[PDB]
Amino acid sequence: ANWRERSDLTVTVGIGNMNKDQQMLHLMRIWEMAQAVVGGGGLGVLVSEQ
Amino acid sequence: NLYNILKEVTENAGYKDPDRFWTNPDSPEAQQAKAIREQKEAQPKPEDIKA
Numbered sequence A: 001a002n003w004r005e006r007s008d009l010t011v012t013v014g015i016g017n018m019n020k021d022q023q024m025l026h027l028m029r030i031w032e033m034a035q036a037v038v039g040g041g042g043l044g045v046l047v048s049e050q
Numbered sequence B: 001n002l003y004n005i006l007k008e009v010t011e012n013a014g015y016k017d018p019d020r021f022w023t024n025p026d027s028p029e030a031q032q033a034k035a036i037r038e039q040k041e042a043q044p045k046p047e048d049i050k051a
Helices: A020-039 B002-013 B028-039
Strands: none
Touching (some): A020 B002
């Protein structure tokens, strides 16, 4: 209905080139943070198994 | 506050939806988890020994 508004997605024809390493390292650091939170006693309240 | 920090880090990383990697502490599941954790603090080992 609201296709004329373009209010949902933004287009990036900006080259989808080599970023995989970037969020890949980000996944490293996020997993490290998750381990820290789990070791801090935050399992089930801050981070779940899913 | 910790949840907000984690949300900010995740969003800066490039993931707009933060619930995929973190759990809101105000969600009912988190409240249930806190209730269970608090209930598991009934009494340590020497309590009835001393009483």
